[PDB]
Amino acid sequence: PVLTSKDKITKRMIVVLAMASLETHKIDKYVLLNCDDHQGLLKKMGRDISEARPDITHQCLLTLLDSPINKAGKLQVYIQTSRGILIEVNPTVRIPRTFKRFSGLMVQLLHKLSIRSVNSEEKLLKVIKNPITDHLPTKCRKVTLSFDAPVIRVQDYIEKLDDDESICVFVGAMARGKDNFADEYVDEKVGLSNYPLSASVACSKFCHGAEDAWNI
Template sequence: MDTQNSIEFKQSCKSIASCQLTRKKNGARAIFVLENASLHKGFIHKKKKILCCHDDSSFLLKQGKNPNDYRPDIFYEALRAILDSPLNKADMVGAVFVKADSGVIIKFKPQTRIPRTFKRFCGIMVELLEKSCVRAKDSGEVLIEVLKEPLALHMPENARIIGLSYSSEKLVDVEDYLSAIQDNSNLVFVVGTMVHGKVSKESTNDYISVSSYPLSAKCCIGLVCEALEQKWKLAHG
């Protein structure tokens, strides 16, 4: 790298760092709400577990249940997409909230490191539903907790709540859409984590679709995170 390019690179890094510092002073963060997450406890082979259609379809059918309604793997992949994103690593995710289809509301702190395997994650969720919180082993800090309803109690006052659904008639280019929003509010993205159905319009400030095609929750979140990383000029790597 020659001297001129080196200077330009350092100036660019300084500009990015300045942008990030300004946003942190303003308090703006991205918040995610994962709606209709499947988190149902069951007792199979003398063991408590989170019911999942992939492993427990026979049991669910015997109980007269539709296995497609038991997809905690969708919620797990969506959560990983947020927590593993460069957006979160840059400290620009304020929180992740989960509205289970059973009505339970859960909060994940952004620094939470969830298990890399789905089976172990389900074990943590069983612990959470029984104890109402999960703490860090070393510090005792609460990383995941069950909250009191309704979710609106836990939203910041300056929140701009954006519902994302393929069913919305408002199709947007997500990068253009987010770049037009000022940084003086916390952006709250509501994403469905169920097989069928759609995110509720209730309590949202806007209701948009980010693709002409149906997307998984994981893919939808990926598009949003990448657009925010571009908007906020976050350095990758």
């Protein structure tokens, strides 16, 4: 029961890795921006020192491979970059584990722009256009992950919504700052636990809420 965006009836959990930072650069050769591997390039570009981190979404592979809802099939991952770019992933991509192979998977952002498999029947990674709401299911809950929002158990939060046909969570995969709350889709923010969680542990807490709500 694989899940694309084009069967908007069924019950899904949509994660939106929002305000990501994976950005390409031209050195003959093609690199992408890490804070660790180059800082003089950030200073010459005049960027902020801190927010050139695709390590956060590469660590948020764990919601793609959060097995007891992804091996149930009921999860789907979209990514929206600070460069305004929406990347779909398929719920059966076996993502590259190491960051050097994830660095090598910049052909989706630069060259190939949609990857096939070795037998090449189902597309894995896509560079689709905005908004997210059109690709979401018909009824869809309106949730971003803030900190100073009211805290609630995501078990009870998913359980009290009887059949809202999905649950979408906009998680800001940035270093510092503030996510687009009133800009696009979310009128109410649900806060997770009492501490300033990182993006990866926020996604994992919501994924495990979905597991123990929908009985893995």
